[PDB]
Paper text:
The key regulated step during initiation is the assembly at multiple replication origins of the DNA helicase known as CMG (CDC45-MCM2-7-GINS), around which the replisome assembles. CMG unwinds the parental DNA duplex at a replication fork and associates stably with the DNA template until neighboring forks converge during DNA replication termination. Our data indicate that DNSN-1 binds simultaneously to GINS and to the MCM-3 subunit of MCM-2-7 double hexamers, thereby positioning GINS in a precise fashion to promote CMG assembly.
The resulting structure, which was determined using cryo-EM density maps with average nominal resolutions of 2.6 Å – 3.8 Å (FSC = 0.143 criterion), confirmed the existence of a DNSN-1 homodimer that associates with the GINS and MCM-3 components of the helicase. Specifically, the folded domain of one protomer of the DNSN-1 dimer forms a large interface on the amino terminal (forward-facing) side of the MCM-2-7 motor of the CMG helicase. In this way, extensive interactions with the PSF-2, PSF-3 and SLD-5 subunits of GINS serve to position the DNSN-1 dimer on CMG, together with further interactions with the MCM-3 amino terminal domain (Figure 7C (i), NTD, N terminal domain). In addition to the folded domains of the DNSN-1 dimer, cryo-EM density corresponding to an α-helix is observed at two other positions within the complex. Firstly, one α-helix is bound to a distant region of GINS beside the N-terminus of SLD-5, where it contacts SLD-5 and PSF-2. Aided by an AlphaFold-Multimer prediction, the amino terminus of DNSN-1 (residues 4-19) can be unambiguously modelled into this density (Figure 7C (ii), Figure S13A-D). The interaction of DNSN-1 with the MCM-3 AAA+ domain and the MCM-3 NTD, in addition to multiple GINS subunits, likely explains the greater affinity of DNSN-1 for CMG compared to isolated GINS.
Author numbering:
A (entry chain H): 4 to 19
B (entry chain D): 22 to 224
C (entry chain G): 239 to 300, 323 to 351, 455 to 476
D (entry chain F): 477 to 594
E (entry chain A): 9 to 201
F (entry chain F): 145 to 238
G (entry chain C): 4 to 181
H (entry chain B): 1 to 180
């Protein structure tokens, strides 16, 4: 899998 | 909302915070998002086996730039709080009573209270315990940003009209029109609300 | 007074700065509008106008009918008023009545002549 | 009193009256007005100005009647204020009698008119 | 001299000496305590005559009060200027006081330095997950790597990628900027142009 | 301290400027509540009627306090703002 | 732990030094206890004339005198000097006259308002004219490398220092690009 | 705010380069995707990335269209004729100085371009000086209009703000000294 900042932001939106 | 939009908003916030003479409403949300993005990119690069190639250097230079922006913003706000901590608490409470957006985040407020106590201890141990009983109150200066000027540029289309003091007759005021590409030398308190709303960029 | 250039003595030499003449023109433009407004839609009976190539009277006939009279015209003046759109009775003098007076008011306000 | 040197070279003194006289010209003050709004409050403010001539004593007396006729006092809990400027250049003209007063800023209501002790 | 001539000398003492902090002047501060107390006792005696309804002179009460407030303003301004001079040192080089500076302080000022440093570190710990060192990124970044000369035998050092470097006296290195910025501040390395 | 009366006390010193501030809008303004400049706009016979009321007040050479009022209050505003002056030069302040 | 709100320039050393200056003044005979001259000023006996006791007093003390007193303008603010400075102040050494020129003038206006309103207004007009004649020269003089700002007031020094700071920054940025 | 931070903000602009390396995937920056790279085919990237590649010999920089000598002459003509400041491209002086510093091999007609940029800077500097001097003689207003000023030009001229703040105090003192 290829890393992307948007997936990280979606994960943090689910966290906070 | 994309991180590409969050960074662009953060840069304009940083420029306005550097130029303004007093404390703008806090934007620590964008700071927290960008710090998390830095950590995610760092761990992703750490999973790589090969590092002497062009992509890793390009990514690391971008992380350098984002770290500079966030660090300089936080340093400027702390240096503003240290000048007069009690007045900052007072302004935050007044904005809360008016029902407006926050002046200080939770960690900033905690820092302000602890610094105020630490500053009070030195004066109490050096001078104020030796005073007569009437003179034992702690002095706190009033605000000082009354006659400050700024260079300001208009970006929004429908800003409208602004009022400024009249130097020919200081009982009254003069009204100005702000066409949507102009640059002005103007007092800060006339454009304060528009700088909060993001319709004006300070230079 | 009198203004009409055929009837003049050697009237005295005068020179004035641009500021005085320009401010005087702005004052005249207000003042003429006030006289015409009070006359048309109020109790003011009549007034006179004198000018370098003409002579004008505004009056009313005994809830009344408004009349305007011009005297001492020429062929060029009569043609120029029709070119300005003032169209009139022509019995040298001239007569205008009613709604057509408004065009003469505009011509007197605006015209180069 | 007849200036021989300056911007008013050979121009005689000014005369002013409130009833016609020979060579007197009838004139009017310049008027303008503004709206100010601030801080999301109820307090929008409405401003009227009269400028570019002498403000003779009858002017304030008639302006009081303009306000009271147009019923701006109806919420007397929200007053209306009036101010006249540069009267110190003519200081002394109200001292010779008990019928006059020095004042600079005045509050109007329907029931009363108020000023400071001055 | 006049009533307030002692107080102005504190202000002139701080005004004449930028940057390099002079030693603390306990004795002049103490004399200012005593002069304020003497003025208060005089006004208290006049106040007791007024309360008793005795003959009294009320004219000097406000001059004595003005003198007391002026002396207090001078003393607190002296302390505040020294406080700003002290607080600047947490951001110069590494966050520590020199011995030559610490010998000039009083104990309350040393306590204030420790309280301020603890408060600043506690604030720094809450940024993000791992905290942020705010002495890093002090200027816009020009490049990734830096060229440095080592001034002393520091020994073994390791970069953030896990590469070992042997910092020894009079040797040249090419290192990432973020890793060795702290050593440049602490005086172990110097930049090579 | 405060001093008061039923009606405006007379002051005979001539001044250079008058300013009036209110929390209630003036009649020609009532469309608007945004910050901005507004023209004092007159309507129909109001100016002429104010001129009539002014001359009728001062016809004897001194003030008559018993003249009836005009119908438009805009005429009262106009009648308050008039005077006679000499000498005359356009474009010079006197 | 109770808080007292005070002036925005409470801690300013320059403002304290400005308050510490003194001016020549005169007090009515017998209307004040002669303990005052030893108690506050340290003078054993006042100098006396037909008009009153004549002394010098500091500004911080003069604000507290709710009794009657009178002020004489110092040498740098006398009316002949006011005419000279209002005529031409573009190249004069104001620091040779007074290092806190505009500040002491503003203090004098606030004190003289109750005695002499016309003199207070005249001095205020003179101060505005004097600063207007010199601000452009200050902002221009800051751009030279050899300028050192010898003649300027403490108020004018702030403008001079800010201009020289900006000039140094832009010259340092330009000389990278050789 | 200072000249280094002005150059830092100017680095975010976009510029076109021709790579000599090649790569398959895009590069997913936090500021957005920039790749992929093909050798000999131009594409647009940020200015900081372009200078970073140019130092490593990985590309060739293509100058902006406003660095043509004819375009610079048009700008100089408009700046000479207009009374106020003429309009310029964004970050004009900063991008000019950065490209002359790091990529002067790829600029065409370098000395003529450099001389024209210096001419434009000289007369804009004179206009700003005259405007500030004429403002500081004022007493009637505390406002001026300065359309088409650049950020670095605004940064170099902060003494006027301090001078106006000092003037306002004396004006307020005169107003409070006016009798009643």
């Amino acid at each position: 899998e290829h890393y992307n900042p948007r997936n990280r932001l979606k994960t943090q939106i689910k966290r906070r | 909302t994309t991180p590409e939009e969050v960074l662009r908003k953060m840069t304009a916030t940083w420029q306005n915070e550097l130029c303004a003479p007093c404390l703008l409403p806090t934007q620590m949300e964008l700071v927290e998002i960008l710090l998390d993005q830095i950590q995610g990119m760092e761990e992703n690069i750490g999973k790589q086996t090969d590092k002497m190639q062009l992509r890793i250097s390009v990514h690391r230079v971008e992380l350098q730039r984002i770290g500079f922006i966030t660090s300089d913003y936080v340093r400027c706000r702390l240096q503003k709080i240290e000048s007069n901590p009690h007045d900052a608490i007072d302004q935050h409470k007044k904005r809360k009573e008016e029902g407006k957006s926050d002046l200080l985040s939770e960690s900033e407020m905690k820092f302000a209270e602890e610094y105020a106590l630490a500053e009070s201890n030195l004066f109490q141990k050096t001078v104020l315990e030796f005073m007569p009983a009437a003179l034992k109150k702690m002095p706190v200066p009033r605000g000082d940003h009354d006659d400050v000027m700024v260079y300001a540029k208009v970006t929004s289309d429908d800003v409208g009209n602004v009022a400024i003091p009249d130097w020919q007759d200081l009982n009254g005021e003069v009204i100005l029109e702000m066409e949507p590409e102009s640059c002005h030398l103007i007092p800060f308190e006339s454009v304060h609300q528009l700088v909060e709303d993001g319709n004006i960029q300070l230079m | 007074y009198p203004r009409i250039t055929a009837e003049q003595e050697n009237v005295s030499r005068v020179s004035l700065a641009p500021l005085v003449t320009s401010t005087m023109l702005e004052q005249w433009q207000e003042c003429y509008a006030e006289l015409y407004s009070s006359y048309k839609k109020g109790q003011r009976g009549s007034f006179y106008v004198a000018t370098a190539v003409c002579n004008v009277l505004f009056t009313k006939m005994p809830g009344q009918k408004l009349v305007a009279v011009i005297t001492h015209t020429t062929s060029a003046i009569r043609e120029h008023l029709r070119s300005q759109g003032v169209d009139f009775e022509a019995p040298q003098c001239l007569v205008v009545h009613g709604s057509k007076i408004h065009a003469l008011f505009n011509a007197l306000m605006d015209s180069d002549v | 009193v007849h200036e021989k040197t300056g911007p008013y070279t050979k121009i005689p003194p000014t005369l002013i009256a409130t009833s016609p006289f020979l060579y007197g010209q009838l004139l009017s003050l310049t008027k303008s007005s503004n709206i100010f709004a601030k801080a999301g409050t109820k307090c929008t403010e409405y401003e009227l100005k009269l400028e570019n001539g002498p403000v003779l004593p009858h002017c304030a007396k008639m302006m009081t009647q303009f306000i009271r006729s147009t019923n701006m006092c109806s919420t007397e809990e929200k007053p209306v204020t009036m101010q006249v400027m540069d009267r110190h250049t003519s200081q002394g003209m109200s001292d010779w009698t008990e019928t006059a007063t020095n004042w600079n800023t005045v509050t109007i209501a329907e029931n009363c008119v108020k000023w400071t002790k001055n | 001299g006049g009533v307030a001539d002692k107080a102005l000398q504190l202000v002139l003492e701080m005004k004449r000496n930028p940057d390099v902090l002079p030693p603390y002047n306990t004795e002049l501060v103490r004399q200012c305590y005593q002069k304020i107390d003497e003025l208060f006792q005089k006004n208290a005696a006049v106040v007791e005559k007024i309360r008793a309804g005795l003959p009294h002179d009320s004219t000097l009460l406000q001059p004595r009060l003005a003198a007391m407030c002026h002396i207090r303003r001078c003393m607190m301004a002296y302390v505040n200027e020294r406080k700003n001079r002290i607080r600047s040192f947490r951001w110069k080089y590494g966050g520590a006081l020199p011995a030559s500076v610490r010998n000039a302080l009083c104990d309350a000022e040393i306590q204030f330095f420790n309280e301020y440093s603890s408060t600043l570190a506690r604030f720094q710990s809450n940024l993000g997950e791992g905290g942020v060192n705010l002495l890093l990124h002090s200027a816009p970044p020009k490049s990734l790597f830096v060229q440095v000369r080592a001034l002393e035998d520091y020994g073994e050092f390791e970069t953030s990628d896990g590469t070992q470097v042997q910092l020894s006296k009079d040797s040249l290195h090419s290192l990432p900027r973020q890793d060795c910025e702290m050593l440049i501040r602490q005086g172990v390395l110097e930049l090579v142009h | 301290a405060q001093e008061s009366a039923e009606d405006l006390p007379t002051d005979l010193r001539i001044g250079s400027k008058m300013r009036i501030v209110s929390k209630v809008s003036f009649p020609w303004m009532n469309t608007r509540k945004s910050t901005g400049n507004v023209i004092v706009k007159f309507q129909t016979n109001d100016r002429f009627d104010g001129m009539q009321y002014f001359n009728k007040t001062f016809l004897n050479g001194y003030e008559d306090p018993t003249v009836p009022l005009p119908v438009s209050p805009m005429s009262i505003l106009e009648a308050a703002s008039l005077f006679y002056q000499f000498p005359v030069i356009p474009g010079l302040k006197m | 732990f109770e808080i007292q709100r005070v002036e925005s320039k409470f801690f300013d050393l320059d403002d304290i030094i400005a308050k510490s200056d003194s001016t020549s003044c005169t007090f009515e005979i017998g209307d004040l206890n002669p303990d005052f001259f030893q108690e506050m000023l340290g003078v054993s006996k006042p100098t006396q004339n037909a008009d009153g006791y004549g002394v010098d007093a500091p500004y911080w003390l003069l604000e507290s005198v709710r009794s009657s007193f009178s002020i004489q303008l110092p040498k740098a603010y006398s009316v002949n000097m006011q005419n000279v400075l209002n005529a031409d102040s573009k190249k004069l050494n104001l620091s040779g006259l007074q290092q806190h020129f505009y500040g002491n003038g503003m203090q004098l206006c606030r004190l003289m308002k109750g005695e002499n309103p016309d003199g207070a207004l005249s001095l205020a007009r003179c101060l505005v004219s004097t600063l207007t004649q010199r601000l452009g020269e200050i902002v221009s003089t800051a751009t030279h490398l050899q300028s050192k700002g010898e003649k300027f007031d403490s108020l004018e020094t702030k403008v001079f220092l800010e201009g020289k700071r900006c000039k140094e920054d832009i010259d340092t940025w330009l000389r990278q690009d050789n | 705010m200072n000249a280094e931070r002005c150059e830092f903000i100017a680095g975010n602009s976009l510029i076109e380069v021709i790579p000599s390396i090649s790569d398959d995937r895009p590069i997913h920056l936090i500021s957005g995707d920039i790749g992929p790279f093909e050798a000999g085919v131009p594409c647009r990237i940020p200015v900081w990335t372009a200078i970073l590649m140019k130092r490593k010999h990985n590309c060739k920089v293509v100058a902006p269209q406003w660095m043509d000598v004819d375009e610079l002459k048009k700008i100089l003509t408009s700046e000479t004729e207009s009374q106020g400041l003429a309009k310029l491209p964004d970050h004009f002086f900063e991008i000019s100085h950065m490209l002359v510093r790091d990529a002067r091999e790829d600029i065409f007609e370098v000395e003529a371009v450099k001389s024209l940029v210096q001419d434009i800077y000289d007369r804009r500097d004179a206009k700003l000086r005259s405007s500030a001097i004429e403002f500081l003689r004022q007493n009637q207003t505390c406002h001026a209009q300065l359309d088409n000023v650049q950020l670095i030009e605004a940064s170099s001229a902060r003494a006027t703000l301090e001078a106006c703040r000092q003037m306002g105090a004396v004006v307020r003192n005169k107003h409070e000294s006016t009798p009643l």
